[PDB]
From a paper:
p97, also known as [name], is an essential cytosolic [name]+ (ATPases associated with diverse cellular activities) hexamer that unfolds substrate polypeptides to support protein homeostasis and macromolecular disassembly. p97 forms homohexamers that enclose a central channel through which substrates are translocated and unfolded; each protomer consists of two [name]+ ATPase domains (D1 and D2), an N-terminal domain (NTD) and an unstructured C-terminal tail. [name] contains three conserved p97 interaction motifs: a [name]-interacting motif (VIM) helix and ubiquitin regulatory X (UBX) domain, which canonically interact with the NTD, and a PUB domain (peptide:N-glycanase and UBA-containing or UBX-containing proteins) that interacts with the C-terminal tail. Here we identify [name] as a potent p97 ATPase inhibitor and report structures of intact human p97–[name] complexes that reveal extensive [name] contacts across p97 and an asymmetric remodeling of the hexamer.
Residue numbers in the entry:
A (entry chain C): 539 to 707, 728 to 763
B (entry chain B): 23 to 499, 509 to 707, 728 to 763
C (entry chain H): 121 to 441
Write the structure that this text describes.
Amino acid sequence: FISIKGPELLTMWFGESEANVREIFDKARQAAPCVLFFDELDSIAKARGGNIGDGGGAADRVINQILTEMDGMSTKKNVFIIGATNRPDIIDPAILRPGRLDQLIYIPLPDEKSRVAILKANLRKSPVAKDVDLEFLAKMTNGFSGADLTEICQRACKLAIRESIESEIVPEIRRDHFEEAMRFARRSVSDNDIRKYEMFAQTLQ
Amino acid sequence: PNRLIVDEAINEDNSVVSLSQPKMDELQLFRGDTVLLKGKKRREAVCIVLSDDTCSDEKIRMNRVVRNNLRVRLGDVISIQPCPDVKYGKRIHVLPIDDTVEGITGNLFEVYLKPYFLEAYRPIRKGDIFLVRGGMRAVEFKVVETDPSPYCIVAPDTVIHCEGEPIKREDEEESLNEVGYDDIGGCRKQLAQIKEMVELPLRHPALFKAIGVKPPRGILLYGPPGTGKTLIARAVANETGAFFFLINGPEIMSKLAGESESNLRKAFEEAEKNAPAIIFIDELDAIAPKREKTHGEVERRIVSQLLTLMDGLKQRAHVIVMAATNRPNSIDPALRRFGRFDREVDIGIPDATGRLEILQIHTKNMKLADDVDLEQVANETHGHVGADLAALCSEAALQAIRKKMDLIDLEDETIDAEVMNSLAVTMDDFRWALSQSNPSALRETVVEVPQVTWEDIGGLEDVKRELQELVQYPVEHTPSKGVLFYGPPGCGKTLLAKAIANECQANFISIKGPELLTMWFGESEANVREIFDKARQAAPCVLFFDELDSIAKARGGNIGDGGGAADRVINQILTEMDGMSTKKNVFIIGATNRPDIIDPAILRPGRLDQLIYIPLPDEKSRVAILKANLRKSPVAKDVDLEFLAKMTNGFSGADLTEICQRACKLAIRESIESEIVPEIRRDHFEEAMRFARRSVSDNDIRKYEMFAQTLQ
Amino acid sequence: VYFTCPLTGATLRKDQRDACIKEAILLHFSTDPVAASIMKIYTFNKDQDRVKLGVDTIAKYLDNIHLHPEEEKYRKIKLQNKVFQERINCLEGTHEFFEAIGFQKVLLPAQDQEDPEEFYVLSETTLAQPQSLERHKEQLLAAEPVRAKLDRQRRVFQPSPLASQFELPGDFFNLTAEEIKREQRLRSEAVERLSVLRTKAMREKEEQRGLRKYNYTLLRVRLPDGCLLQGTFYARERLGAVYGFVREALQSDWLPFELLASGGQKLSEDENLALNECGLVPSALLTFSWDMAVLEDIKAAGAEPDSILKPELLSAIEKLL
Ligand SMILES: Nc1ncnc2c1ncn2[C@@H]1O[C@H](COP(=O)(O)OP(=O)(O)O)[C@@H](O)[C@H]1O
Ligand SMILES: Nc1ncnc2c1ncn2[C@@H]1O[C@H](COP(=O)(O)OP(=O)(O)O)[C@@H](O)[C@H]1O
């Protein structure tokens, strides 16, 4: 797994060092089998202004070099490219043409059954008391992301550990530890951000 | 038992040492009792013991004069043996050391020994060496005869004799005028970092000889010239005992091909022969400049020779190489690879406290007049480094010397000690020197602890608590490492960042619009990496990015050119933030007056996760603001600040300040006109209110409230 | 630290003071019940503000009957009165005082309740002569708590030169693995503490750890004749009590002298400063010297000042080992 982050794409543009794009794809060719993950694909469009910018398109030096390398990469090298963005509305449409990242998958906030599954999965490493109501927590955390549900379970784990250590100066995480964890956990994704994502997904039909 | 580790002194006096009280209680000795200290080579020294609130329970604090008499160094262990049997002396014969009595004559007893011992009751042992400062010289004396033996206490009835030639210093005796730790003022933290890295492999070399893991091979000290880069390297070598070898770029580069590389590798061989040793290479950027800058064979070959000599340190046991440069990015990058010079320390520029300490160091031997205020001088000498404060003291001394020596009219090879004894440097002489001195580090950014406190900020009681919780929680018990402030201008955004830095005693790094714009305009956004590296080196610090939208506005803001919300500098800032951990003791604060046009990336999880709204002050806050602004001036009882606050409903904190400042100016003008009234009267505020206006409109408040509700 | 019990002369430690004095006051009732109850009211009760209000309220009840001795409504002091309950009934020893100065404790029917109430009723024998209660009123109001006096334990010592003769082992200067690892850890922790970003509250929590260890001091004086004079003082004691202590020890208590502190600051007899303000707590050595005026006469007359202390103290001199 090769992790490529927005800051790398941003530096290449501003420093006129797009040759580093070849290094990224060359590493994937040499690391094969591998998955080459391009995070923050929106960073290029944002570098050109993103929300404001000029009157033109998203095409630029860095995306042109990236697209060129993608076209020259064969599936016979066992290299698969995955992209991600939090602002799909400003991604250069060229990257979505056949031969590139033509497949689009929407990853919404977890729903009622998924949030319970997330809370349960995070607790496989620790005993959970029978008084813990994970479905109740999932019902309250309607606006929470998977990252936020993990903090709830992990914080409850730390709280149970704190009590366990103090008892020797406990065998499982109790309901009180999850209810206390809820006092600090917050949703990271606002209602306005959710509507932006749902409207885009609806636009794609 | 009854033995402690030798540490640095707090009290500079040469006859006293300090213990932690619990050890004085175990030794059953009182504050002021005389004790013997047992050192190496069957030597001992006699001194008075006190106590303080800072000495460690297992350490004894003593200065250089006491350590030299015991032939011990910092980190060693000595025994403490109370000696209440010490009696008062009858006759003591003291003679100077020749090395420090040169060019000076006259009656040394009347100038130095008499006031030093008179009614001081200092313990003295035969063979002791002690330092008496005065007359712009540092003159040390050795005791050659005591009527009681082997030690006594000097009394007002004790005869002090001094007859004979000065004593030639013995080869085992070190001069007290050699630079040590007590000669370094500011940058205490940086010196502590060098101690951690360097003193252990030099004082206890066996810990690294028995293992395959080598101590740090090189330390790169960087910062403006005149900050103490060489002084630290010399002080560490002199205090630990390691042989100090001095190298510099020009000395090597001035030599011809072959001779140049020979001298460079010869010095390394000598360090091994004299190990433990420290090799200090000054002007590293001159001896090892970036290769792409020249076609000369000598410049490339010297870099290659230095690279191999650094790598050879795995064989040259107990040799540590230190280097000095102006900036870590001005040297051939090969030197900074794993090993070699992969560790660096930012010395920086002394702040007001450090500058005062430096001035006090340079005046060790100087007689000052009662009107001299070195703290006031340190506050005015902004942009000066230790090299400039050294020149400042010298110039002030020279002006005082001319004023009096033109009256003495002594034309000879020496100057009488009595003439120097009566010479004092007054405030007029420092003031003159300040006018002639010119700081060498005025263009470089000065980073220090701000003087803004919480009493200077009116209102915002909840924001004050929030900032204290954000910094205190990760220390008392993922915590956020940054906050964005938004809202109308002139409400205290900057003061909030400074006040939290003040209370924490943290360094404040102020980045303003023009600085962000300069980096964008000149395509030098790479400097953002140095800014974040400074934030790490300055830790604990608060890294404040003001006017985050200054570039977006400069490029159009409401209209726009070829860009939008993101730019060269903001994107580099985002890059570096991802590499900073919550454990780096750096708190990043941003501010903007136009959150609708700011790159939203800065608020994404892991960055500026905290978001605080700063509204216009309410009625009770406006009163608090007026009182804070007037806290530094006399105000008449007829001034009704609550009534004013009731009227100035739409005024920001900055707008209320204009009212206070206008009233202050009017009071000053009236007082001056009367002399050609002693406090600010209501009439001055009533006039001020005729010109002051609110800077924030009602429509602008709605814009901020909508954003606040959009993000929650 | 040692104290003398003011009522018995017994030698006590700092913790034994209340136990002995309280017992002495309870026994004193066999000699003078009024004096014993007065000491009991001030000594047993730690809250002196309530004691001062209690004895003032008692003084008012006594003056009320003094103004109208012919009116029976002033002869009985109700123990359930709001002012009596708050100031008098809450203190130990106030009931014993009333009985000692001629009041009988009785139960009388209430003017509006079935349950009898408690009263102190003055007898005819004492009511006939108000001068007795007037004297007892002043004896209570002018009183103070009984507290054991600090024992100075005046001693003179002669240091033995033998205490300074000791040789170290050859391995004395060779530090252990724990001493070297501890020192390097302290260096790393010192650099880390300078690097930590913390608020003032966390800074004070650590600094405040050094604030509560001492409230008494032992002082020593080094005399020109080679003798050491020692004694015990309270941390709040004034410099004038040290000069008085030394004057009593000197062969000539009238002969002017000065005491110099261990920090080089001269202590004047006319400076009413506390020992914990001058830096003489929990312990300090002072340097003794005669005034210059008398030293000039001593030298001019050919007299060797070979005796500083009175023979009455020197005959009991102890050695330091
Ligand atoms: N931080 C400091 N503290 C005390 N003195 C300093 C400091 N920095 C510089 N000085 C003084 O300035 C001078 C430095 O000159 P030099 O030995 O060439 O060192 P450098 O040029 O590397 O700073 C010395 O006189 C030194 O005492
Ligand atoms: N809350 C406040 N309390 C007291 N004074 C304030 C406040 N807000 C603004 N001021 C005044 O406004 C001036 C500028 O404040 P500053 O924080 O620099 O504004 P900004 O952060 O918008 O640049 C300060 O000198 C101060 O006197």
